[PDB]
Paper text:
Determination of the pKa values by NMR spectroscopy requires relatively high protein concentrations. In particular, it requires the protein samples to be soluble in a low ionic strength buffer. However, wild-type [name] [name] crystallized readily in a low ionic strength buffer (e.g. 10 mM sodium citrate/phosphate buffer at pH 6.5) when the protein concentration was above 0.01 mM. Structural analysis revealed that Arg-8, Arg-21, Arg-42, Arg-54, and Arg-76 are involved in crystal contacts.
Protein stability can be rationally improved by optimizing various types of interactions. One strategy is to optimize charge-charge interactions on the protein surface. The electrostatic contribution of an ionizable group to the Gibbs free energy of unfolding can be estimated from the differences between the pKa values in the folded and unfolded states of a protein. charge at 298 K and 333 K were similar, suggesting that the electrostatic contribution of the charged residues to the protein stability is insensitive to temperature changes.
Numbering used by the authors: 1 to 97
Amino acid sequence: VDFAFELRKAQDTGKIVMGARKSIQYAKMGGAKLIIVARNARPDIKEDIEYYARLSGIPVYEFEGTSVELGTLLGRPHTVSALAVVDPGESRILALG
């Protein structure tokens, strides 16, 4: 699965929500279809995300990259340490699950 491509595709054709806060929020509300977390997401933040996702049976795929690398992918001027896919759109981003 072409992560970078599929991520962008889901960005351009679906619904992704960025940030640890929002991802935990969509996890506990079960609104998220998948969560992506940066390899180096801050351990205390990463553990909570990973807990809420598990609580809700939501899949989590660890991006093998940094949060500055994930942020640059999403074309953001800032770090992204986790993201929740609400709508995959036309992409295969759920195949990461």
